[PDB]
Symmetry: D2
Subunit: 178 residues, 4 copies
């Protein structure tokens, strides 16, 4: 019943982070937020130039090797362990592998009660937001806007194309069982 | 004829910075961007706790003393001097003093050709964006959303309430004389 | 035998973060880094103004309530779980409660093989570094420089007062069993 | 007599920024700080991928085209204009072109009273600091540690190899005529 984890998925610049900060502000109980971004931050800088690490193409492409995956896996188990320990966890991710990515998460989550959230945004609009924020390799937003959701199942879907972050947060919070 | 300076004015979280980065990306010639934020960054940290410096109330209020103003003034003259020297300058400001603030700028600009831009956004929406970005004292957006424009004259007015940054940028760029 | 976790402890501005980035660069296998700072980053912003959250006095003091501790605890278990899952983890912390803080960690770590590192630095020197970095409430460095180590047991002790970060990293890496 | 501008020069990771923040804290009157870094921040993002812009080699090299120089020039005149207007200005730069770079500055400064400061640091030590800060293309520190000072004349020289930032700041402040 009680929601233990909220997992958001969406392409770059779709507005996930904004929603996450809004959720932490809205939800009455403290929710810890982690994502692919905080993970990369925690990983050694050299992981970004390693063969089986993560590579950012000059055109927005993203490649993930086995070195990166092995680490992500251990990190995923720890996040889930935090939840089982009683910490409310929000996860901000980008399912580059679509359904396969969701399956991987299901693999670690087990029978833990999770709220699967889909965060959509039109590719062109996301691209514009990408330009507006100045901190992102041009090309990611467009490349991830749709592929990332293929075959993925959600409990709640919000679209930031015409909805503010705080509004999407309200929509998501209503599905969070205390 | 040729536009030398573009001066944007709007309350916190109205979307100025995003527009500025979009303008720099859109406009063919290189435009340098400076604002009240880069200025505070360049000022000594202690200016933020000084009597006549700048004080950020715990509720979003902002007070500016004479120490801060004297410095801002010299900085304003330098920015204008950069323009007269041939650098295209975009300025991102918050006219806390409404029309009085614009007059001060007119004072430094002289006969330099400037494009005065107004950046509006509904207070409640800006407040939500304030929460979404996690980096801003709650209360500023609402407090500045309207007062900042009172008696101020613009050449172009854009509203981010329902327009993306890149779109407002297109509207502004069209008024920029090469 | 194989070192699973490296736990650094030291006052603010003692140089922990620099050492951590050096360790990640030096150590051949990928090491994930988390600390009290990344934790606060992951916690809701409001935790910083909550009764039992974390409060930063205007003079450098730091208070931690039960709300903050409960969360930290669940986070600690997750970090350890990441280690047991095979991820090499570096932790950057500040034992405000001296020995009591180390005991708490021992509580979560169990029989996991950990490398306890002490990072010292003269109070006055740390204070200067605090001023130099511009991002830290004046007063923390001096307040934490010594109290934080009282009754704490280390496997390796480095002092940044006259040693570069990369050098302290070499000293620490030598004690890391592959 | 009265010092109007303080111009620091030194290779990447030599410790300039730290010194600058210390100077702003130490000096009684408010000093505005600008540098090659704040300039790049103010320049359009695309300047970093333009033919005559600025290019960061994957090995630490830095190339500056005419597009970048033209803008820098106008910016230099504005900074000086700020000084003539009464603002105390600290400048943090990297004289890639050695003496030629200093001549260029002399060109804009004119008869303005300037305090020329040299900030040295051993290449290997700077390289280590480069690794420690995680935010800098590996290779810059070593490449700039010496070449940057060739044929350059200073009023004060400090060396961060064995001196803290706050200490170098004290040495520099003593040469500042009120
Ligand atoms: N609903 C929205 N409408 C307009 N702008 C938005 C909206 N949500 C977020 N933004 C802004 O768009 C930018 C990109 O959104 P982010 O929240 O940073 O996206 P993201 O999902 O974090 O990516 O990480 O993947 S990269 C930020 O600068 C936000 O402030
Ligand atoms: N048109 C927009 N629609 C939705 N979100 C936007 C829009 N423009 C900007 N944002 C986001 O809203 C946040 C606040 O906008 P900013 O551009 O940072 O405002 P601001 O004018 O810079 O302030 O400085 O004053 S504070 C950022 O995180 C942006 O990504
Ligand atoms: N050994 C050192 N000698 C001189 N400066 C250093 C040294 N180690 C770190 N620094 C610098 O001092 C500043 C403070 O050090 P940090 O590594 O940020 O300290 P810290 O342990 O992270 O804190 O978090 O607690 S706050 C940073 O700006 C570093 O670049
Ligand atoms: N005297 C010092 N001893 C030890 N570490 C220092 C010293 N001065 C600065 N540092 C640290 O070394 C790092 C690099 O120094 P910075 O001040 O950032 O160099 P920089 O001159 O700014 O470059 O810009 O060019 S890049 C920072 O993280 C500082 O905290
Ligand atoms: O250390 C490195 N590589 C080897 C293989 O040459 C390695 O197995 C590795 C790759 C990435 C990584 N990380 O993220 O810390 C760690 C080790 C390169 Cl990053 Cl220099
Ligand atoms: O820009 C970055 N990451 C974006 C997402 O924020 C990139 O689009 C990305 C997408 C997926 C990913 N992953 O899950 O493997 C990693 C990075 C990091 Cl360098 Cl901050
Ligand atoms: O130095 C200070 N104050 C005096 C008056 O006590 C001063 O005239 C002043 C205020 C702000 C400032 N600044 O921004 O650098 C400089 C000096 C305080 Cl910030 Cl400690
Ligand atoms: O949050 C900040 N500034 C905002 C504007 O970005 C604040 O609303 C503000 C408004 C006006 C101002 N001024 O022009 O005097 C200074 C700060 C700085 Cl601390 Cl980054
Ligand atoms: O929501 C809040 N407080 C209550 C008590 O009034 C609460 O139990 C709490 C405190 C901190 C916190 N956090 O970090 O998310 C969460 C809830 C205040 Cl932060 Cl407004
Ligand atoms: O400045 C901050 N934290 C410093 C340590 O980096 C503060 O000294 C501190 C010390 C101990 C602590 N804790 O473990 O409870 C939290 C913050 C955060 Cl706001 Cl980034
Ligand atoms: O706009 C661009 N280039 C042309 C030449 O193709 C131009 O003259 C230029 C280069 C850098 C720049 N800047 O920094 O804004 C501006 C224009 C490229 Cl950055 Cl896409
Ligand atoms: O890393 C950067 N700049 C460093 C100096 O901080 C680089 O070494 C550099 C050196 C000289 C320069 N210039 O003056 O032309 C520009 C960048 C910027 Cl991307 Cl923040
Ligand atoms: Mg995100
Ligand atoms: Mg702005
Ligand atoms: Mg640290
Ligand atoms: Mg610098």
């Amino acid at each position: 019943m009680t929601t233990r984890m909220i997992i958001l998925n969406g392409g770059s610049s779709a507005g996930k982070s904004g929603i996450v900060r809004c959720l932490q502000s809205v939800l009455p109980e403290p929710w810890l937020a982690f994502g692919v971004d905080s993970l990369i931050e925690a990983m050694p800088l050299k992981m970004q130039s390693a063969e089986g690490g993560i590579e950012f193409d000059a055109d927005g492409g993203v490649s993930i090797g086995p070195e990166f995956r092995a680490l992500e896996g251990a990190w995923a188990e720890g996040v889930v362990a935090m939840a089982r320990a009683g910490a409310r966890i929000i996860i901000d991710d980008v399912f580059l592998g679509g359904a396969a990515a969701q399956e991987r998460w299901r693999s670690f989550v087990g029978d833990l009660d999770v709220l699967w959230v889909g965060v959509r945004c039109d590719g062109a609009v996301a691209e514009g937001r990408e330009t507006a924020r100045g901190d992102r390799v041009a090309g990611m937003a467009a490349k991830q806007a749709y592929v990332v959701h293929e075959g993925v199942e959600y409990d709640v879907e919000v679209d930031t194309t015409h909805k503010e972050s705080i509004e999407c947060a309200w929509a998501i919070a209503a599905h969070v069982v205390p």
